[PDB]
RNA sequence: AGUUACUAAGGGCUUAUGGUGGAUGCCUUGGCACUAAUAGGCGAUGAAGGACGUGUUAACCUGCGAUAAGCUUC
RNA sequence: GCGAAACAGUACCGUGAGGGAAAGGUGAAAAGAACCCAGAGAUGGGAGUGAAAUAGAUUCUGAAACCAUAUGCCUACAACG
RNA sequence: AGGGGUGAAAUUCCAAUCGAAAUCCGUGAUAGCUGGUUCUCGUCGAAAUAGCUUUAAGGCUAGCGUGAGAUCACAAAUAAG
RNA sequence: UUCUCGCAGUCAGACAGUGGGGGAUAAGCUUCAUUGUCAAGAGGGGAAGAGCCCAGAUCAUUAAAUAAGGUCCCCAAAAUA
RNA sequence: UUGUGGUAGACGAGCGUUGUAUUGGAGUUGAAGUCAAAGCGUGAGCAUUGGUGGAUCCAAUACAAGUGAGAAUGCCGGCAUGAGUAACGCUUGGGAGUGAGAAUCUCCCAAACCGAUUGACUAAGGUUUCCUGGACCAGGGUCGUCCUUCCAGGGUUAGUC
RNA sequence: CGAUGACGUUGAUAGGUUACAGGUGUAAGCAUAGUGAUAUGUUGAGCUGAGUAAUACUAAUUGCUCGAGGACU
């Protein structure tokens, strides 16, 4: 078609995915779409799992996904991390977090859900 | 009983808000509150504040129970419109309709008011036929 | 395309038929007791199990 | 689309300045016929 | 074996009810045609008409004019 | 009825010749719904004044077409100005 | 600046428009041609022919059809010779 | 059915048959004269058949005789040699 | 007795509506008018009753109709239809706070762009739309607690520009 | 989209965990030499948008509704 809007695109997809990854990891807690959290929750058990060798590889491996924050920095993002976020889940092979349904949402009415993890 | 409480013509499509309205109709005020605390209808919003302010009217206003009361009947009157432009090709510059609602709904308590309005029209006829035929008398 | 007649109350009104509605999904919240809709969190915090959300 | 009206003021002001036509008997019997009509404008300086 | 129910989503048929809709029922310090007494100009002493202003009174209409919502004589 | 009963030559339009509409009515005096309630208020409802709130400011009355609701009648095997 | 202007010509352009711009007036110009003209009832009841016309979907005259006036059966057909 | 007076309306007819023409004796054709229809007349038949046949509608009738035509059913009516 | 089919057209008999002077009447103990009804007329019309409405109307005889409404691609107004239909007119996400209400409110921070201009001096034009506080009916292609929204207050200061 | 089908907690329906096929190819780092363009053991090294097995690690909940008395002869 003529000039428009590009709006959601591949890139801007995994872009996306790599804000709301950071943000669950920065804070814990992510109330967002449900259709595109379960590729979330995928890649956040998949960066995990891969966070938990704790190498130098390993911090190569995060300098991919990191993106500061307003206070939370990527620096303070890979150091919590190493430090007590990835080593907390060794206990658990798969299964790290869980997507509860929230309401849906009040401008479109689309499935919104929060994203949390516990262990 | 009727227990009313109009909203009085605010902007709103009767065509979207009667189905919703439509709806709650034969349904108890208890069992439908719950249902409509959860759709994301921009036709909830109000229809929950005019539920809380029907119960309230009903319960002080006219001293009613509300543990029988159910939705005898709801109506999206017809509301007047307003007229816009809209920037088209050449300049055509079509009109587009507005529309508002005189809403309101209707609560009842007694299992009565479906054939004692039946029983008032045959009151009224009996008083024509009564004033027709007493002229009738004599004549 | 176009049309060289109108619509009629009872066609729309049977077209209208399967625009119809339906009803949500509703199961119950014992610790802020109330019916919510089933397969999700309520209004009051907790989608199962132990508080996962705040009051509001 | 660079439009019929370019609205350069002075032009204007040289049209329906009143001195403007008050050079022209034509324009004097038409501000007259106008003062009959009643209209709130006369002149772009007598609104 | 026969066999009609309930169904009704919705429709239409009669009745009543409610919402625009302003329509007729009624009227207007409003316009229209006139009759009759009068007259047929004003102005460089700066007419009118506008701008500007003038509120115990925000805005507007109106009156007014630096004496500025009004002054003097009778 | 002059377009001109409302602040009409208004608004608006074409820079400009010029075109040029729309709408009045509460009540009897606002004497404008105090009281109480839901809600953020708007709004609405009981209460009261008011003869009358079929007199609530959308303000003498408020038709039908149009939009709905329900008493009953039937229709989801039916080629139908 | 319009029975005007501009134009390396294309009837280019001249207020989104040009075989000669728009605007008010003559003007309710004309219109053999289109379109339409709203309460009821009762009776009788044609033509689409002939002739003419710068005349052919137009107009005119006899004609018919009707209302009414007169003739009075000598009139007309009606059927037989 | 002739005259007197006014008002019209029609000349823009069609269809089938009869005597024709032109055509091409072809036409659901054309200029004609006659018959009949419609226009200005629906009715029954022809499965329907605007102009063919039978035929001429104050109205209601749930009466009969009839015309064209039909009488195994739709759809009204039959059999006998 | 002919009849009562008959367009064009000829012709006849009428009905109602208003006001004009009436003879008369009713009406807050309900008039005009509106809706309905299960009346009378071949018909123009008239009732009668029931409901609103709370203040004018009509019966009978002549006068005049801006008088009697089916079409004029008739005029205006309202209401639909299509119909939730094409589209929503150059672009994101998360977190904190406020509000009762969070994607259209603010704030923190990220990607994306222009960056010979998505920067700036300005001219010209709009000519206070500019700023602060309140509110967000109405205009915002949804949105709202928000606007370049409305209201109140306020704002642009030249000797060389 | 409605809808077909399976699984719906005692769950193998889908997803994460390791495991495999296959493929990108020799990775990063460590050490070697040429200062450096470079190749070497590591190094057939990883993992995958979607392929396959188990594992309940998570989700499909400690949810609700219609739905049976055989009418008539």
Request: aromatic letters at 4%.
């Amino acid at each position: 078609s003529y000039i428009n809007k590009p709006g959601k695109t591949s890139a801007w997809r995994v872009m996306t995915v790599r804000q709301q990854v950071s943000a669950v990891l920065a804070y814990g807690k992510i109330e967002t779409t449900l259709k595109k959290a379960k590729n979330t929750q995928k890649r956040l058990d998949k960066l995990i799992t891969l966070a938990k060798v704790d190498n130098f590889n390993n911090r190569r491996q995060v300098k991919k996904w990191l993106l500061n924050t307003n206070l939370f920095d990527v620096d303070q993002l890979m150091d919590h991390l190493f430090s007590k976020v990835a080593p907390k889940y060794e206990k658990t092979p798969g299964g790290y977090s869980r997507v509860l349904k929230l309401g849906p949402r009040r401008g479109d009415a689309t499935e919104m859900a929060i994203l949390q993890l516990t262990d | 009983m009727i227990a009313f409480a109009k909203q009085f013509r605010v902007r709103i499509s009767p065509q979207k808000a009667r189905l919703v309205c439509q709806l709650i109709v034969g349904k108890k005020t208890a069992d439908a509150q719950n249902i409509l605390s959860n759709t994301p209808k921009k036709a909830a919003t109000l229809i929950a504040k005019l539920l809380n302010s029907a119960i309230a009217n009903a319960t002080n206003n006219h001293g009613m129970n509300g543990d029988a009361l159910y939705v005898f009947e709801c109506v999206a009157n017809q509301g007047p419109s307003m007229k816009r432009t809209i920037p088209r090709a050449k300049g055509s510059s079509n009109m587009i309709t507005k529309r508002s609602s005189n809403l309101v709904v209707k609560l009842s308590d007694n299992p009565n008011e479906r054939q004692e309005l039946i029983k008032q029209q045959k009151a009224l006829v009996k008083k024509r036929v009564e004033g027709q035929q007493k002229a009738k008398m004599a004549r | 395309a176009v049309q060289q007649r109108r619509s009629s109350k009872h066609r729309r009104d049977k077209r209208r038929s399967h625009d119809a509605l339906t009803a949500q999904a509703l199961s119950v919240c014992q610790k802020c007791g109330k019916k919510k809709l089933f397969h999700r969190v309520c209004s009051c915090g907790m989608y199962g199990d132990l508080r996962v959300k705040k009051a509001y | 689309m660079k439009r019929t009206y370019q609205p350069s003021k002075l032009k204007r002001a040289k049209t329906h300045g009143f001195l403007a036509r008050m050079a022209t008997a034509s324009g004097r019997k038409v501000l007259k016929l106008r003062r009959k009509k009643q209209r709130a404008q006369l002149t772009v300086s007598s609104e």
